Short mmCIF file of C-alpha atoms and ligand atoms in Angstrom, two decimals:
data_model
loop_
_atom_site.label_atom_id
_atom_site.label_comp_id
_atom_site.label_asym_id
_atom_site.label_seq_id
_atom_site.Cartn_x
_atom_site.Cartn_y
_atom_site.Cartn_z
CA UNK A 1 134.65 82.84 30.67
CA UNK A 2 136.79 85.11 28.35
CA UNK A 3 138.92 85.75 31.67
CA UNK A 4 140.09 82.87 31.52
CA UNK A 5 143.78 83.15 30.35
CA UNK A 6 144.12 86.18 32.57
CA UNK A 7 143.25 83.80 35.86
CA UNK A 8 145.63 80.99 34.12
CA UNK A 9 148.62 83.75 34.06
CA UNK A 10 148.00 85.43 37.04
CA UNK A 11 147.69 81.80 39.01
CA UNK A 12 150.62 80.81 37.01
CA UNK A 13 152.65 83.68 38.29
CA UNK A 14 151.33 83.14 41.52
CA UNK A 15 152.13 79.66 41.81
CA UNK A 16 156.12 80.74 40.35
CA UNK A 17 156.51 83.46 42.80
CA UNK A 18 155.34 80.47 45.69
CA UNK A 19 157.96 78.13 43.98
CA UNK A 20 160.55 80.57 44.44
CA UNK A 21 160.28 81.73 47.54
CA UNK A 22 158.71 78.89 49.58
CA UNK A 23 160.50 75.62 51.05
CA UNK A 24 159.04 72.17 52.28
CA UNK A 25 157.74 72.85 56.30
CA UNK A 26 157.88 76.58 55.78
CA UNK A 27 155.23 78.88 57.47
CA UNK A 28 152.60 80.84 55.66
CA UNK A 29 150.41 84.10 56.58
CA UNK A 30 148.12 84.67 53.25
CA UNK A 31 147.21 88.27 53.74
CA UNK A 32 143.85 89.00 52.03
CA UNK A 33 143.67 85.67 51.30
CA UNK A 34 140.33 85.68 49.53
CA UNK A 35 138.74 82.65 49.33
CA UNK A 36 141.79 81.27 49.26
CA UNK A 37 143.26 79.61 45.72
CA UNK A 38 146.20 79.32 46.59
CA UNK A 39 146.03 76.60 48.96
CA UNK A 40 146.29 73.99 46.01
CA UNK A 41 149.72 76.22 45.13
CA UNK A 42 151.01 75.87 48.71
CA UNK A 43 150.08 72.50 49.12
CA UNK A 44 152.19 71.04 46.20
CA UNK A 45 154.71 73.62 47.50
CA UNK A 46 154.78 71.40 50.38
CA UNK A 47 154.52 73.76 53.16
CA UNK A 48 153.51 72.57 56.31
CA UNK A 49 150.85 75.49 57.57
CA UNK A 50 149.06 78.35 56.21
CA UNK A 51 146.93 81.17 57.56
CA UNK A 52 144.84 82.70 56.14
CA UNK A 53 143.71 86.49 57.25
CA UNK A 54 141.36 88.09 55.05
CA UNK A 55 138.85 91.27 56.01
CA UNK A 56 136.07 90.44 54.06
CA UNK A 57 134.42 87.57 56.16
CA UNK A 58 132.45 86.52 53.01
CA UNK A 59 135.53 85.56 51.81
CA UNK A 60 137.34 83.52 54.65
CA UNK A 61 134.35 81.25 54.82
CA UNK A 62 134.91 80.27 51.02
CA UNK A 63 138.43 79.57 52.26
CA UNK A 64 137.79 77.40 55.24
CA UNK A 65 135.33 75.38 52.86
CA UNK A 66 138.07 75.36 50.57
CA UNK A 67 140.39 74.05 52.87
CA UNK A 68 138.03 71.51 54.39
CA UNK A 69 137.08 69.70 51.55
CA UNK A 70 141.06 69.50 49.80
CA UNK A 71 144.07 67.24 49.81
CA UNK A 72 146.45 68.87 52.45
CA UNK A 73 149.28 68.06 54.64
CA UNK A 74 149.53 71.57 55.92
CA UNK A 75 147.64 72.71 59.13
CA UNK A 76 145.50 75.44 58.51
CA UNK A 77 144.41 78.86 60.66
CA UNK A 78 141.84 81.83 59.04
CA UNK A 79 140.61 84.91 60.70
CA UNK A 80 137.90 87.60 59.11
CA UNK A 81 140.45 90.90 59.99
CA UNK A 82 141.46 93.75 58.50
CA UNK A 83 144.91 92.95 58.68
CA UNK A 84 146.83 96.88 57.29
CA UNK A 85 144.91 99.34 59.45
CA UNK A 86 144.50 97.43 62.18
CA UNK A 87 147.15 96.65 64.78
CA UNK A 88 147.72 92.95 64.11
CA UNK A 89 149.07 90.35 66.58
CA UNK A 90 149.16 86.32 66.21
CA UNK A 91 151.43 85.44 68.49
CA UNK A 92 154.22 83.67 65.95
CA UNK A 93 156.16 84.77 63.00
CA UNK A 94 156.09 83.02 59.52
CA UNK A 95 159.15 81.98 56.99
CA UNK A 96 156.83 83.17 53.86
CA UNK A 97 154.07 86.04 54.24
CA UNK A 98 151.78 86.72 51.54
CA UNK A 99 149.72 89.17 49.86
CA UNK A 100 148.46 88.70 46.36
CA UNK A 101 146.21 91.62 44.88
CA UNK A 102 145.84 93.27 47.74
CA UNK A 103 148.65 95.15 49.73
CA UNK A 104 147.36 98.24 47.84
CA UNK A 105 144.71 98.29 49.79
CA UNK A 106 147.18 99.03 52.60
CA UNK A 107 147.78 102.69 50.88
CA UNK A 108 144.09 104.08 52.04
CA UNK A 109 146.24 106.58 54.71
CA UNK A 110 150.11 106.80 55.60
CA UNK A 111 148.45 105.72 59.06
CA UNK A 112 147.21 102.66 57.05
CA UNK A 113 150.08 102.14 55.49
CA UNK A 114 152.41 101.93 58.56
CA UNK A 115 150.09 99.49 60.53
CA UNK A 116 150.06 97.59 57.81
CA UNK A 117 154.14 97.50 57.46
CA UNK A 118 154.57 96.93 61.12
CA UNK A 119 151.84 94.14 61.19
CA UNK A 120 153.98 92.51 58.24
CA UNK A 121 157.75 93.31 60.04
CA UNK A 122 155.92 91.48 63.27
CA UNK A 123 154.62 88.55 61.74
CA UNK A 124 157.70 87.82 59.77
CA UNK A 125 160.59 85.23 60.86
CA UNK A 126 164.21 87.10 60.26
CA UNK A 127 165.35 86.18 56.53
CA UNK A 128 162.17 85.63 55.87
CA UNK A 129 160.32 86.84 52.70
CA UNK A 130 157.03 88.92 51.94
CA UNK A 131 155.98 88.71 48.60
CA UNK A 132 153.56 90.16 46.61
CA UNK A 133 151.61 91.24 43.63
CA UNK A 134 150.77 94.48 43.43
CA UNK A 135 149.15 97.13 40.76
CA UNK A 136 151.77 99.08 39.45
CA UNK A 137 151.11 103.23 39.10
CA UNK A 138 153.90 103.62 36.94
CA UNK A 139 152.44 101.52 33.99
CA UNK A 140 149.01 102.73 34.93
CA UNK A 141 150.05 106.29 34.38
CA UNK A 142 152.12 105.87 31.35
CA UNK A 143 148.41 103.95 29.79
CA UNK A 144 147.21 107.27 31.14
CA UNK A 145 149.29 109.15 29.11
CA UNK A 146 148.93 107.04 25.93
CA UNK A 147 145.24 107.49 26.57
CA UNK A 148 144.16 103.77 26.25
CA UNK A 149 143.22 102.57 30.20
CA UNK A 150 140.42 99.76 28.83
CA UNK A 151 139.11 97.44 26.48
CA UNK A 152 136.62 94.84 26.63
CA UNK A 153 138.29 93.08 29.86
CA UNK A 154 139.05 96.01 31.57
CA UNK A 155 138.66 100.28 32.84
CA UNK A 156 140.37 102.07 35.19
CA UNK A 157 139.45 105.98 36.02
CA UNK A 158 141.58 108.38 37.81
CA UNK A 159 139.69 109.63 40.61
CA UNK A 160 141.43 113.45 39.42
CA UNK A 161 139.87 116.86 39.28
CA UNK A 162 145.57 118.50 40.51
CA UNK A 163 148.38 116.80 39.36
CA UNK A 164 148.17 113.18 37.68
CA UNK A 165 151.40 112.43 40.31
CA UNK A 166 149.18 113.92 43.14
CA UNK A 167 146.52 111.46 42.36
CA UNK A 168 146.36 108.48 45.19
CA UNK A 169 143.46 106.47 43.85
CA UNK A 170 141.33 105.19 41.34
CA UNK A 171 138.59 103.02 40.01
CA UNK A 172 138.64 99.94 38.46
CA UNK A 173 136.81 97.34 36.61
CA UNK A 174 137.66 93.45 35.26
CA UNK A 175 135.13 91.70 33.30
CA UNK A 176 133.42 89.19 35.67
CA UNK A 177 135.35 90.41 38.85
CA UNK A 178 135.08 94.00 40.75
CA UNK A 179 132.45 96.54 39.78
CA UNK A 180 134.05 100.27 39.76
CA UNK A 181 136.54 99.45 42.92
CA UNK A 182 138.34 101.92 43.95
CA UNK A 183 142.23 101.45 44.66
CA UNK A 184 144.80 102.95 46.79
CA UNK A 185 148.08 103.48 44.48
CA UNK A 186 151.14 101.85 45.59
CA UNK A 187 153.24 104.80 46.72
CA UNK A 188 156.45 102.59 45.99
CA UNK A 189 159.08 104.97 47.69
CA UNK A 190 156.73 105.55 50.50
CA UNK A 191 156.58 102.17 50.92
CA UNK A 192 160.24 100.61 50.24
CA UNK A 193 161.48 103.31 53.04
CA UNK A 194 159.06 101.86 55.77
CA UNK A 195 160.06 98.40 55.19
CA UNK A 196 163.35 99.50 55.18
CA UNK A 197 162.88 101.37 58.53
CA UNK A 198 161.36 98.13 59.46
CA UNK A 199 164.62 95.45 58.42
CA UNK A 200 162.82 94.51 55.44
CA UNK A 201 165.04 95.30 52.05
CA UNK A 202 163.48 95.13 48.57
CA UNK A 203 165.11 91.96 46.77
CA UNK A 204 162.96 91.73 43.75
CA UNK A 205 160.56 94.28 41.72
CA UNK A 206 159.78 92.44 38.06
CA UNK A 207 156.62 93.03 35.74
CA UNK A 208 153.92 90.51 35.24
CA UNK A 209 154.63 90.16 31.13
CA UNK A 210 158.00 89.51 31.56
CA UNK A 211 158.38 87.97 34.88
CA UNK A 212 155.62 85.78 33.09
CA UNK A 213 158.06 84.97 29.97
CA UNK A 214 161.22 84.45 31.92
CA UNK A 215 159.58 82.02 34.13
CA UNK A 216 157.70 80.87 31.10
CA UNK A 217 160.48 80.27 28.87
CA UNK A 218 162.22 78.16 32.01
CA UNK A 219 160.02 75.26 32.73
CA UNK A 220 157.52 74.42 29.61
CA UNK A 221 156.40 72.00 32.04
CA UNK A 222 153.96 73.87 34.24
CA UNK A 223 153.24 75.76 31.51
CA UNK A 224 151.31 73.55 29.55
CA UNK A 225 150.15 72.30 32.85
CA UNK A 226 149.03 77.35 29.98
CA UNK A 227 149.63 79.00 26.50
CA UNK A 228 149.98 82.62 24.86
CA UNK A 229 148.02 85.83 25.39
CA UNK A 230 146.38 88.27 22.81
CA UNK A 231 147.65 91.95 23.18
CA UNK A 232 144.16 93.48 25.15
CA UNK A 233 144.73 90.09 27.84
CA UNK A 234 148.38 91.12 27.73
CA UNK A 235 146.84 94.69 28.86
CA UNK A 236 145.39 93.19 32.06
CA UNK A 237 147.95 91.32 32.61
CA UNK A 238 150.69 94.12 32.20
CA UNK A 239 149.24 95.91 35.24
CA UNK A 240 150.52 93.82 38.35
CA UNK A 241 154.24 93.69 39.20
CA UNK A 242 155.83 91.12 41.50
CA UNK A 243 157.64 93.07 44.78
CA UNK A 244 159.75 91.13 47.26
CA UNK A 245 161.55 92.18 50.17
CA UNK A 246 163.18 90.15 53.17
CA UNK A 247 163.75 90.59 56.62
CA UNK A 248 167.24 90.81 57.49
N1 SFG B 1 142.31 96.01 54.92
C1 SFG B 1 142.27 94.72 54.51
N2 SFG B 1 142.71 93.71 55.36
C2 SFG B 1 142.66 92.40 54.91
N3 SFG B 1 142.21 91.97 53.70
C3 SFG B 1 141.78 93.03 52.90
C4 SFG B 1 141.78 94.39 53.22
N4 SFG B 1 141.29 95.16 52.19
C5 SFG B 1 141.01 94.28 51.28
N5 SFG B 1 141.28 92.98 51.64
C6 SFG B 1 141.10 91.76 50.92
O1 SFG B 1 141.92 91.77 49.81
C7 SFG B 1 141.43 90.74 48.95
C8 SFG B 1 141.95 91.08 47.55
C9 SFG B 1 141.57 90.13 46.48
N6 SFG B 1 142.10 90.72 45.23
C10 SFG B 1 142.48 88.96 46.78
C11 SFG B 1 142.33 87.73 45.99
C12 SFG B 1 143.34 86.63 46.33
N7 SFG B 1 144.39 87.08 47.31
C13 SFG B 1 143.95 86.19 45.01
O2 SFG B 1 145.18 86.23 44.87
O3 SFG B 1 143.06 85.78 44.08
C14 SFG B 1 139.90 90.84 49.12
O4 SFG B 1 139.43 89.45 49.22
C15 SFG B 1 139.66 91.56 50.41
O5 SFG B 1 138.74 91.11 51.37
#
């Protein structure tokens, strides 16, 4: 693949932002879980269970391979649901809940949106932390502006006709991934007030570049475990921004 060092950051940041936030025994809901990487991340992590919810069905059953066939100590739950706009109810709360490239798809409608943020507030032990990993519209409208928005990994379209800051969606396209998908952008405002409504507080809003640097330049170890990117990786790569915010 010429992906590759895009997957190797991304999972790299992915496996940080776990490290972080996530303690030996803790609880785990993996929100559009996909087919479900991450279990290897959590698993080292030492948590002790992890569901995974995921709407695309196609999907969970990767996942619940996945999980059969690995090395875990955690117990492990999946369900094929649209899990932002669709009322949502498991029945317990979780000490970590998860969503990695894919809470923008909670932004469809503010209807969407606010299912979504209630389904996360309900599903989420007190002091516990949602984190995620989300496209971020201020970098992709400043590449707007600049006029690059591609290059042989990448395109992204504004679905415009009307205001670039009116604009709530787009398409986009990764080299061996999706195929002209459309996203919701991540009204952050919008979205920071409902959690706050909701006794979740933003504790942490960092880039993917740096975020990747920092944690880069702090433990070598995993790294290598890695290496550098060119400038049009870097591009990818500078799209996503890590968001955390806590229940208190
Ligand atoms: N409304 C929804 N409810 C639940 N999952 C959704 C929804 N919309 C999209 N998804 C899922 O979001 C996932 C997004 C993928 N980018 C996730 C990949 C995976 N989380 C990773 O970090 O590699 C897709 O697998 C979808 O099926």
């Amino acid at each position: 693949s010429k992906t590759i060092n895009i997957r190797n950051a991304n999972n790299f940041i992915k496996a940080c932002l776990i490290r972080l936030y996530t303690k030996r025994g803790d609880s785990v809901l993996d929100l559009g879980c996909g087919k479900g990487g991450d279990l290897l991340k959590y698993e080292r992590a030492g948590i002790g269970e992890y569901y995974g919810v995921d709407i695309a069905e196609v999907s969970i059953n990767d996942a619940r391979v996945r999980a059969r066939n690995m090395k875990r100590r955690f117990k492990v739950f999946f369900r094929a649901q649209d899990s932002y706009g669709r009322h949502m109810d498991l029945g317990k709360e979780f000490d970590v809940i998860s969503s990695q490239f894919s809470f923008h798809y909670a932004f469809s409608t503010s209807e969407s949106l606010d299912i979504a943020q209630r389904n996360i507030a309900r599903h989420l032990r007190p002091g516990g932390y949602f984190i995620m990993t989300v496209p971020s519209r201020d970098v992709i409208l400043e590449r707007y502006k600049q006029g690059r928005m591609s290059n042989d990994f990448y395109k992204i379209e504004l679905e415009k006709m009307v205001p670039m800051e009116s604009v709530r969606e787009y398409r986009f396209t990764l080299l061996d991934s999706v195929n002209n998908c459309i996203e919701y952008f991540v009204d952050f405002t919008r979205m920071v007030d409902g959690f706050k409504r909701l006794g979740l507080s933003l504790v942490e809003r960092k880039g993917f570049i740096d975020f990747y640097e920092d944690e880069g330049r702090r433990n070598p170890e995993l790294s290598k475990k890695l290496g550098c990117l060119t400038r049009e990786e870097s591009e990818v790569v500078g799209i996503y921004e890590v968001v955390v915010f806590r229940k208190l």
